[PDB]
Design a protein around this ligand. Structure first.
Ligand SMILES: [Zn+2]
Length: 483
């Protein structure tokens, strides 16, 4: 079935690119890949039309170093159900292996067999398979800071074959990860219902964030209070159940879900979906349309006013089903009638902290079912944000919400739901008139981006640039410096 061009020529793997520097030590696994069609884009296209597969492959490795470096790498094949975590460089020579110097101008070849105890593999129902492992065999001396770039190419062996025809692109587990082609003038903020202004790198005191809107993994798993509508970010609806007099007016509100269903407090969610996930005074518009008809040509009556929702206080308890608003010196809200809130911005920058999570069940309770905190782990990297600027009702300031993902990428990751081949995907930011990349970043499975920078500053880009998915990499991959 396979075209004889495919069987004769090597094509770059989707898990292909890696690095080796003299900051690496012999004993660290630089490359750990698994057998299967995902190592070849033509086979990855043909795999979406069949049910199963069997067969081994052939791997070519290119190294790019000069005549001023020294050292040896080793590439070996490791069978299924063998532990890989405590391999030493002495043990890896007891496998089918190849040892190469870094000064060479010629690529390296290794066959990767398909050792199995059955007739074929299924695309669903995964099972362990053969792997290829690379570690540094002798220490790397770049005498006369020099990072060496490396690529992996594959092609099928003469015994590789596909088994049963299924309808194309229906069966999952064969879908490739794609990233949508949208510019920053077309993306939207995911933690507040405005549009994205620029890209920005994190401050020196921000090393770990935990937000609850705009959290979604690359596999398409919504987390926290993340929903899909832009009109539902920082918005809620329900009925007024209470009234209070103060300097102001208070209007306690029992909230429901945004589809109209009542909110069950025992669900595995921190709060109803789409409530604000930061501390501050959210400014917006509250509105009522009545449920009974006063005469009025057989129509209901309507109210709409300005309101403030403070989320740092003891009465912002959306997990318990309550929220309290405020109208400055206005009393026109009927009790026992439905309300809807539409967010506009903030009132002032008082008690405004964007990286502090509210107490969703109030005081005397702990937040449960929270999305996990994210952070960079590689030495010398920081978080990358998408920054918008918000309106204020009064006072002085220039407030800003940062987000981890654009809302359109959340939507695309939900609709596609492709499997993740590794822990980190390498992306680049392409200038489409020339083809030159501007910077490169890491995109993690949990849904956040890190760059290699020393400053907290806005990122100056052209107007038509976009991100492009290039490869799946591992944790040892060393990004080029952004500045
Ligand atoms: Zn009142």
């Amino acid at each position: 079935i396979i075209d004889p061009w495919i069987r004769a020529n090597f094509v770059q793997a989707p898990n292909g690119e890696f690095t080796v520097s003299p900051r690496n030590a012999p004993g660290e696994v630089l490359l750990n890949l698994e057998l299967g069609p995902e190592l070849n884009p033509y086979l990855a296209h043909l795999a979406r039309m069949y049910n199963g597969y069997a067969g081994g492959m052939e791997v070519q490795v290119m190294l790019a170093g000069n005549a001023f470096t020294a050292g040896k790498l080793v590439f070996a094949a490791v069978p299924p159900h063998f532990p890989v975590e405590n391999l030493s460089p002495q043990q890896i020579t007891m496998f089918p292996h190849v040892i190469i110097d870094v000064r060479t101008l010629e690529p390296v070849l290794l066959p990767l067999p398909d050792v199995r105890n059955n007739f074929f593999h299924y695309n669903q129902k995964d099972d362990p398979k053969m792997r290829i492992v690379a570690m540094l065999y002798t220490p790397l001396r770049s005498n006369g800071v020099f990072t060496v770039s490396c690529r992996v190419l594959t092609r099928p062996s003469p015994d590789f074959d596909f088994t049963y025809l299924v309808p194309p692109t229906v069966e999952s587990k064969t879908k490739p990860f794609t990233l949508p082609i949208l510019t920053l003038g077309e993306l939207s903020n995911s933690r507040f219902p405005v549009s994205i202004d620029q890209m920005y790198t994190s401050p020196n005191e921000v090393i770990s964030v935990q937000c609850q809107n705009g959290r979604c993994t690359l596999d398409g798993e919504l987390q926290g209070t993340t929903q899909l509508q832009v009109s539902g970010i920082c918005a809620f609806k329900g009925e007024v159940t209470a009234h209070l007099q103060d300097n102001d007016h208070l209007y306690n509100i029992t909230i429901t879900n945004l589809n109209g269903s009542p909110f069950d407090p025992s669900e595995d969610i921190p709060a109803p979906l789409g409530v604000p996930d930061f501390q501050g005074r959210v400014f917006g518009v509250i509105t009522q349309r009545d449920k009974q008809n006063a005469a009025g040509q057989s129509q209901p009556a309507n109210r709409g006013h300005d309101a403030v929702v403070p989320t740092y206080t003891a009465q912002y308890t959306p997990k318990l089903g309550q929220v309290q608003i405020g109208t400055w010196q206005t009393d026109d809200l009927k009790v026992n009638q439905p309300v809807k809130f539409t967010p506009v911005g903030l009132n002032d920058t008082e008690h405004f902290n964007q990286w502090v999570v509210p107490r969703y069940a109030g005081a005397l309770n702990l937040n449960t079912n929270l999305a996990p905190s994210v952070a960079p782990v590689f030495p010398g990297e920081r978080l990358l944000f998408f920054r918008s600027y918000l309106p204020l009702k009064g006072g002085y300031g220039n407030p800003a919400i940062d987000c981890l993902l654009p809302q359109e990428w959340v939507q695309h990751f939900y609709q596609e739901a492709a499997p993740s081949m590794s822990e980190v995907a390498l992306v680049r930011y392409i200038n489409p008139d020339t083809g030159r990349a501007l910077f490169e970043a890491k995109l993690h499975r949990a849904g956040f981006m890190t760059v290699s920078s020393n400053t907290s500053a806005p990122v100056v880009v052209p107007a038509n640039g976009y991100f492009r998915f290039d490869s799946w990499v591992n944790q040892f991959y060393s990004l080029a410096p952004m500045g």
